[PDB]
Amino acid sequence: LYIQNL
Amino acid sequence: LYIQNL
Amino acid sequence: LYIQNL
Amino acid sequence: LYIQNL
Amino acid sequence: LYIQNL
Amino acid sequence: LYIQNL
Amino acid sequence: LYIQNL
Amino acid sequence: LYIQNL
Amino acid sequence: LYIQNL
Amino acid sequence: LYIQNL
């Protein structure tokens, strides 16, 4: 599970 | 589980 | 579990 | 468990 | 458990 | 499992 | 498991 | 497990 | 396990 | 386990 907010 | 907010 | 806020 | 706030 | 606030 | 990004 | 980023 | 970043 | 970063 | 960073 990989979550990135950029 | 990887969470990054940038 | 890895959490980074930048 | 790794938490970093920068 | 590693917590860093910078 | 609940995930929300806003 | 609950994850929210805002 | 509850995670919130705001 | 509860984690909140604000 | 409770963790809060503010």
Residue numbers in the entry:
A (entry chain A), B (entry chain A), C (entry chain A), D (entry chain A), E (entry chain A), F (entry chain B), ...: 1 to 6
Give the published text.
We introduce two APRs - designed variants of the incretin mimetic Exendin-4 - that both display crystal-phase polymorphism. We found that a simple change in crystallization temperature or modest changes of chemical composition of the solvent system (therefore the available interaction partners) can prompt formation of significantly different nanostructures: we identified four different polymorphs of the LYIQWL and two of the LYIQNL APR peptides.
In the present work we therefore synthesized the Trp5Asn mutant of LYIQWL and found that it forms a purely class 3 amyloid crystal structure. While the class 4 structure did not contain any solvent molecules, the class 3 structure contained both water molecules and two ethanol molecules, one in a solvent channel near the chain termini and another wedged into the steric zipper interface. In the class 3 topology (monoclinic crystal) the same faces of the chains interact with each other, thereby forming two distinct zipper interfaces, namely that of Leu1, Ile3, Asn5 of chain #1 with Leu1, Ile3, Asn5 of chain #2, as well as Tyr2, Gln4, Leu6 of chain #1 with Tyr2, Gln4, Leu6 of chain #2. The assembly is stabilized by a hydrophobic cluster formed with Leu and Ile side chains complemented by “pure” Asn-Asn and Gln-Gln H-bond pairs. Finally, ethanol molecules insert themselves into the zipper interface through the formation of multiple H-bonds with both Gln and Tyr side chains. However, it should be noted that in this crystal, the ‘odd interface’ (formed by Leu1, Ile3 and Asn5) is a dry one, that doesn’t contain a solvent molecule, and therefore this molecular architecture may be stable even without the ethanol molecule present.
